[PDB]
């Protein structure tokens, strides 16, 4: 859904259409997200500081 905002999400209504179904049937209790970082010429290139 396109929007032009940073924070304090709008009060508009937008239903979520489903996506591909996964018939797995396993055990689950925890999760984590993944992020991407950039290594330009400003940074030395080491993932320390």
């Amino acid at each position: 859904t396109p929007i032009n905002l940073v924070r304090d999400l709008p009060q508009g209504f937008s239903a979520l259409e489903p996506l591909v179904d996964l018939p797995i049937g396993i055990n689950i209790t925890r999760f984590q997200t993944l992020l991407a970082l950039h290594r330009s010429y400003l940074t030395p290139g080491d993932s320390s500081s």
């Binding site: 259409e17 489903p18 018939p23 797995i24 049937g25």
Partner: protein
């Protein structure tokens, strides 16, 4: 002949609490419409006609109900068309006597 190499492939089939993801080639009889026939589209054994509807179903939906909470609209998978379910006919025999 007994010393020639042979390639052996072994197939194993197991059942778990996970639902069926592999199925053998499913048969599919020809679709007849506008007639009082019986169908089983994986969730109900309904008997009735299959008319051509004018309402589109979203591309994830296989079933369909109404105000009175009755399954009267089911999507055919192979042709992805929307067909309504209607009871054939029922009633009584009334007579007039002079």
């Amino acid at each position: 002949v007994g010393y020639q190499p042979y390639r052996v492939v072994v197939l194993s089939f197991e059942l778990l609490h996970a639902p069926a993801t592999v199925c053998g080639p499913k048969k599919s009889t020809n679709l007849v419409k506008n007639k009082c026939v019986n169908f089983n589209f994986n969730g109900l054994t309904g008997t009735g006609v299959l008319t051509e509807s004018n309402k589109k179903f979203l591309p994830f939906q296989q079933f369909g109900r109404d105000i009175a909470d009755t399954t009267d609209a089911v999507r055919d998978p192979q042709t992805l068309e929307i067909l309504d379910i209607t009871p054939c006919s029922f009633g009584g025999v009334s007579v007039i006597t002079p």
